[PDB]
């Protein structure tokens, strides 16, 4: 047979496509899962992680810190209008409140 | 001479259950809103969809007014103000006021 | 089990010199798990509403369009349409 | 076309809401909040319809959109 090439390598993504495929197959969402469905899911998860990690890196660069701490994640997630809507119902552990003083 | 007649109107409107907004301008507004996101093509509406949308909008508006009036009487005055309803939308949450 | 590799991989891809603490790794892990669950549940009720038993690529696209806000989703949609067109290209 | 929700209509809505006095500056923002509520709900219902191969928004898709947003509505679901 041919060489064992993972579908994540042939899709140009870093997230595993077989893992999310197995998770959807065992997730009891539907008895049949499509072929391109885990690929789309891996792509959007990869994009979301890239967006939040880029924001975290921008939030940690100014503090002269080369390590992402959970405080940086909160500061990055509460400075983006869309990410705040996506993460409005959630709260991040070990994350302080944004510094705002009323007049 | 009919003085302080608003209380009778309050009781009559709270006892009734019919829709308060007319259907034709509301349907025109709904079509004007829907034409923006459909990239141009014209869509058709069902007879019950517009009625359900009007019922939901009326419920939303009556919630906003009934929780903002208590904010106004919390400040000490009886006149409803737009800053008060804006503050009510801000404090109600992302999914409750918006 | 929990995946902490891919997060480190995409972090090194987006930034060559930034690390990440162990707690932030668990935060990102729980975050992607919750997002995956939300999108999958949305797609599942979508397929159930239309008497469909298979979750094709259209269901997940419409599900992510419903869940994710407006400006991001477009981008995300693009990413989706940039992924499958290569996956079926081979 | 947003002038449909006229001044006595919003007045009657506030009267049903228990409000007594109404300032004259409310009619410039209640139309806006109605507009944003409709722009959210109708967009959710219309992508609900567009997932399937249909072109008419039905009452089922509106209540589906309302349930996904968080304010479920009974009576028309069926």
């Amino acid at each position: 047979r041919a060489k064992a090439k993972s579908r994540s390598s042939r899709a140009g993504l870093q997230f595993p496509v077989g893992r999310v495929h197995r998770l959807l197959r065992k997730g009891n969402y539907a008895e049949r899962v499509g072929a391109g469905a885990p690929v789309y899911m891996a792509a959007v998860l990869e994009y979301l992680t890239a967006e939040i990690l880029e924001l975290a890196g921008n939030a940690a660069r100014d503090n002269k810190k080369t390590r992402i701490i959970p405080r940086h994640l909160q500061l990055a997630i509460r400075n983006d209008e869309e990410l705040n809507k996506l993460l409005g119902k959630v709260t991040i552990a070990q994350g302080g409140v944004l510094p705002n003083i009323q007049a | 001479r009919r003085r302080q007649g608003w209380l009778k109107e309050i009781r009559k409107l709270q006892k009734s259950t019919h829709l308060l907004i007319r259907k034709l301008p509301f349907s025109r507004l709904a079509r004007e809103i829907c034409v923006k996101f459909t990239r141009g093509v014209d869509f058709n509406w069902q007879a019950q969809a517009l009625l359900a949308l009007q019922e939901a909008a009326e419920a939303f508006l009556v919630h906003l007014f009934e929780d903002a009036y208590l904010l106004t009487l919390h400040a000490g005055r009886v006149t409803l103000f737009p800053k008060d309803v804006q503050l009510a939308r801000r404090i109600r949450g992302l999914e409750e006021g918006l | 089990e929990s995946y902490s590799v891919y997060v480190y991989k995409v972090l090194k891809q987006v930034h060559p010199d930034t690390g990440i603490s162990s707690k932030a790794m668990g935060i990102m892990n729980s975050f992607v798990n919750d997002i995956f669950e939300r999108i999958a549940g949305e797609a599942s009720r979508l397929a159930h509403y239309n008497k469909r038993s298979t979750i094709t690529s259209r269901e997940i696209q419409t599900a992510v369009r419903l869940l994710l806000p407006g400006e991001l989703a477009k981008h995300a949609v693009s990413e989706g349409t940039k992924a499958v067109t290569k996956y079926t290209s081979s | 076309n947003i002038q449909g929700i006229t001044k006595p209509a919003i007045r009657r809505l506030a009267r049903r809401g228990g409000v007594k006095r109404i300032s004259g500056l409310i009619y410039e923002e209640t139309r806006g909040v109605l507009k944003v509520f409709l722009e959210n709900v109708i967009r959710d219902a219309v992508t609900y319809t567009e997932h399937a191969k249909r072109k008419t928004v039905t009452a089922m898709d509106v209540v589906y959109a309302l349930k996904r947003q968080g304010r479920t509505l009974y009576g028309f679901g069926g």
């Binding site: - | 918006l98 | 991001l72 | 944003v36």
Partner: peptide, 18 residues
């Protein structure tokens, strides 16, 4: 790149007129 534009509108929620 064309990464999503970020603005800082007066409104906390970006619902009306971005």
């Amino acid at each position: 790149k064309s990464r999503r534009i970020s603005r800082r509108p007066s409104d906390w929620w970006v619902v009306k007129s971005e």
